């Protein structure tokens, strides 16, 4: 109940400090990417616990948010890394792959990376977007208790704080009020496409995923 | 359409609104799995024709090439149906108003296997809109955004980047949404917060759409050709 008292700058600083490291691929291709994703997942948990307001929530709810968001988070991280490598996805510094190397998903990832490039997405805006995804992707599916409804409001209030943060970053960058609301919209609409990609990828898997207990156990430590 | 005032944008959108259709009459009740699917499938099909008329009247849409218009529709058609359903169902807590003569609750959708999830998700969204007091002029803006956004990234060449115009119009709709919020007397802070809240919901509407498609291929979606033919008129 005090991430609600943070300012835009403190919010950013906290998020920038919580950033996971860029991990390397250990050296088929599914093995390297699965292993990479697995090691990344462990850092994602500690990153989450450092997102302002996340630990204010019950364990059950923390797990659910991650359960619904973990894939979208890996994906937006990938897209951010690959921003300055047109036509290539930088899974790891030692694992840069082009188109020809689930092509649908690969193409959508490139498309999103190009979009971030065009917009000149800033690192400070990136960490904000990643936070939004965490708090948003599972908020509409929590369920009758006063506590549950107590969580929802809290999450919504934190998301408001992040919106305030994003706007502030744009004002500081010298954007007009009109340019501010426009860029906010452009950024948030991209999240819909990231959601879409996560869903597509998720059905390819069905065609051992982080289950509910796998995460709940990992959060304990 | 980049010359319209926010007021003129709202008016044009409101005028484009499709009519509410009825589920075909005197179906055998209670329902069977295949009876339900038939009624809803038939409804969606008849609604698709009107959605296209609506799209043609969305400012900026006609400026695109036929091919691009079909692509946006192929991607967004289901999301557009769903946001319409959620809007209709707003003042019916715990129920979904697929049609004025077809008001179903949680347990009347248990007919189909797995579609209960989607039912719950649709109900949750409707509650959210209700809680936010989503206004009509905001709804039409959100729907237009879905149309122009859902397929904008999954379209190179010079002519192609000029079409990606779409982002200008989306900016225009954002301006309109904000203007609507300023009129109502919201503070700047409140304005950007509400704008964010609305757009984040689109992410969830996308999700519900994807779950739908998932079960569709799990049990004859509007084809490219079909959508093109109906566009030509
Ligand atoms: C282009 C998506 C493939 N991909 N990406 C990833 C992936 C891994 C880590 C990461 O940070 C981002 C990713 O997209 C991945 C992980 C396991 C398996 C797969 C594959 F689809 F190939 F089976 C993974
Ligand atoms: C479900 C999609 C494939 N996949 N699997 C995984 C995956 C990674 C680790 C793990 O322990 C289990 C997984 O299914 C994955 C991770 C990131 C990105 C992707 C994707 F391919 F979708 F882009 C991943
Ligand atoms: C959530 C109910 C399922 N549903 N909804 C719809 C649907 C139809 C029209 C509309 O405006 C909104 C809808 O959710 C639908 C259409 C065809 C088939 C189905 C079914 F799942 F049963 F197979 C449909
Ligand atoms: C039955 C699969 C899902 N579906 N299919 C359809 C659908 C509608 C018309 C048509 O010609 C074919 C369809 O699969 C549909 C329409 C509205 C809502 C839904 C959904 F269930 F996802 F909510 C629809």
Swiss-Prot record, chain A:
Source organism of the structure: Homo sapiens
Subunit-structure text: Binds DNA as a homodimer. Can form a heterodimer with ESR2. Interacts with FOXC2, MAP1S, SLC30A9, UBE1C and NCOA3 coactivator. Interacts with PELP1, the interaction is enhanced by 17-beta-estradiol, the interaction increases ESR1 transcriptional activity. Interacts with EP300; the interaction is estrogen-dependent and enhanced by CITED1. Interacts with CITED1; the interaction is estrogen-dependent. Interacts with NCOA5 and NCOA6 coactivators. Interacts with NCOA7; the interaction is a ligand-inducible. Interacts with PHB2, and UBE1C. Interacts with AKAP13. Interacts with CUEDC2.
This protein's name: Estrogen receptor
Chain intervals for the UniProt region annotation (Transactivation AF-2): 7-221
Modified residues (Phosphotyrosine): 212
Lipidation (S-palmitoyl cysteine): 128
Mutagenesis or variant effect for residue 81 to H: In ESTRR; highly decreased estrogen receptor activity
Outcome of substituting residue 212 to A: Reduces PELP1-mediated activation of transcriptional activity
Residues that bind 17beta-estradiol: 40, 81, 204
PTM comment, free text: Phosphorylated by cyclin A/CDK2 and CK1. Phosphorylation probably enhances transcriptional activity. Self-association induces phosphorylation. Phosphorylated by LMTK3 in vitro.
Job of this protein: Nuclear hormone receptor. The steroid hormones and their receptors are involved in the regulation of eukaryotic gene expression and affect cellular proliferation and differentiation in target tissues. Ligand-dependent nuclear transactivation involves either direct homodimer binding to a palindromic estrogen response element (ERE) sequence or association with other DNA-binding transcription factors, such as AP-1/c-Jun, c-Fos, ATF-2, Sp1 and Sp3, to mediate ERE-independent signaling.
Extra remark beyond the main annotation: Selective estrogen receptor modulators (SERMs), such as tamoxifen, raloxifene, toremifene, lasofoxifene, clomifene, femarelle and ormeloxifene, have tissue selective agonistic and antagonistic effects on the estrogen receptor (ER). They interfere with the ER association with coactivators or corepressors, mainly involving the AF-2 domain.
Region (Interaction with AKAP13): 1-221
Signal sequence bounds: none
Reported impact of residue 87 to V: Destabilizes the receptor and decreases its affinity for estradiol at 25 degrees Celsius, but not at 4 degrees Celsius
UniProt domain NR LBD: residue ranges: 7-221
Tissue expression summary: Widely expressed. Not expressed in the pituitary gland.
Subcellular location: Nucleus; Golgi apparatus; Cell membrane
Illness the protein is tied to: Estrogen resistance: A disorder characterized by partial or complete resistance to estrogens, in the presence of elevated estrogen serum levels. Clinical features include absence of the pubertal growth spurt, delayed bone maturation, unfused epiphyses, reduced bone mineral density, osteoporosis, continued growth into adulthood and very tall adult stature. Glucose intolerance, hyperinsulinemia and lipid abnormalities may also be present.
Lineage: Eukaryota, Metazoa, Chordata, Craniata, Vertebrata
Protein family per UniProt: Belongs to the nuclear hormone receptor family. NR3 subfamily.
Gene: ESR1
Self-association, as annotated region: 1-221
């Amino acid at each position: 109940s005090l991430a609600l008292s943070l300012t835009a700058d403190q919010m950013v600083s906290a998020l920038l400090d919580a950033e996971p490291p860029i991990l390397y691929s250990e050296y088929s291709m599914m093995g390297l990417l699965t292993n990479l994703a697995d090691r990344e997942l462990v850092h994602m948990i500690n990153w989450a616990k450092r997102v302002p307001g996340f630990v204010d929530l019950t364990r059950h709810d923390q797990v659910h948010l991650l359960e619904c968001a973990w894939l979208e988070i890996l994906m937006i991280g990938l897209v951010w890394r690959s921003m300055e490598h047109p036509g290539k996805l930088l899974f790891a510094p030692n694992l840069l792959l082009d188109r020809n190397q689930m092509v649908e998903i690969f193409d959508m990832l490139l498309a999103t990376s190009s979009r971030f490039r065009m917009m000149n997405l800033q690192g400070e805006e990136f960490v904000c977007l990643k936070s939004i995804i965490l708090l948003n992707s599972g908020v509409y599916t929590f369920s009758s208790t006063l506590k549950s409804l107590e969580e929802k409001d809290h999450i919504h209030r934190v998301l408001d704080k992040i919106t305030d943060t994003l706007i502030h970053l744009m004002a500081k960058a010298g954007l007009t009020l009109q340019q501010q609301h426009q860029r906010l919209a452009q950024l948030l609409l991209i999240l819909s496409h990231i959601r879409h990609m996560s869903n597509k990828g998720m059905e390819h898997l069905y065609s051992v995923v982080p289950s509910y207990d796998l995460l709940l156990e990992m959060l304990d430590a």
